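Q: What does the predicted 3D structure of Lysine-specific demethylase lid look like?
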Amino acid sequence: SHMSGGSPLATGTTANTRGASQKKGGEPPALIVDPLMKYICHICNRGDVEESMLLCDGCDDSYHTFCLLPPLTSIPKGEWLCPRCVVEEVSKPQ
Ligand SMILES: [Zn+2]
Ligand SMILES: [Zn+2]
């Protein structure tokens, strides 16, 4: 059996991708701006307007009116419930 025709597929290509790997080329180690306690709107990571910052009566966390979609056209005259808790029934998971 002499089936040695001899046909190599010698076809190269310059496959080069320089993956620039600067882990902190624009990422500084941020220090704790709120070391003790400060009611910050965790949706916007900032306590922008404290006068528009609500605290869920049936939870505990700081939200802005602005940070919710759509922004709360009326400021809650009574204690504000988070939309999570607003969808309740007699049977809680307790
Ligand atoms: Zn906010
Ligand atoms: Zn709640």
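A (community wiki): The structure tokens above were generated from the sequence. The helical segments are 83-86. The chain has one domain: 1-94.
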